[PDB]
Write a protein that binds this ligand. Structure first.
Ligand SMILES: Cc1cc2ccccc2cc1O
Length: 113
């Protein structure tokens, strides 16, 4: 299937133990997809002061369309030193590894793989 319904744990940036997916745009998009597939991916909602507390390159989920079954359709866009790889809609948040941190909510998405 081109898309997958996921419920992502929403984490507070100060709880996150592993603050990115790796060291290159291609690596972080790769790792993000593997963590999504394995159910070990979290979401941090972007506010003032969040991104400087996480590691570049960043992996964003962005709204890909204007919401089947409660799930917003999203796709992955990476960012390194102010350059984005992909073009999409509004940021829903930044993806990070999940290693058992307690979430504040769950965000239902329909993810383009
Ligand atoms: C991102 C992503 C998620 C998946 C979930 C279930 C099965 C396959 C998947 C492949 C993917 O690239």
């Amino acid at each position: 299937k081109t898309h997958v319904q996921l419920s992502l744990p929403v984490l507070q940036v100060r709880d996150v133990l592993v603050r990115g997916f790796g060291d290159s745009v291609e690596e972080v998009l790769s790792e993000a997809r593997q963590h999504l597939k394995d159910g070990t991916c979290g979401l941090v909602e972007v506010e003032k002061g969040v991104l400087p507390q996480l590691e570049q390159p960043y992996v964003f989920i962005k709204r890909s369309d204007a919401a089947p079954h409660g799930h917003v359709m999203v796709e992955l866009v990476a960012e390194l030193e102010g350059i984005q790889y992909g073009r999409s809609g509004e940021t829903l948040g930044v993806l990070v590894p999940h290693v058992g941190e307690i979430p504040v909510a769950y965000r239902k998405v329909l993810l383009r793989k």
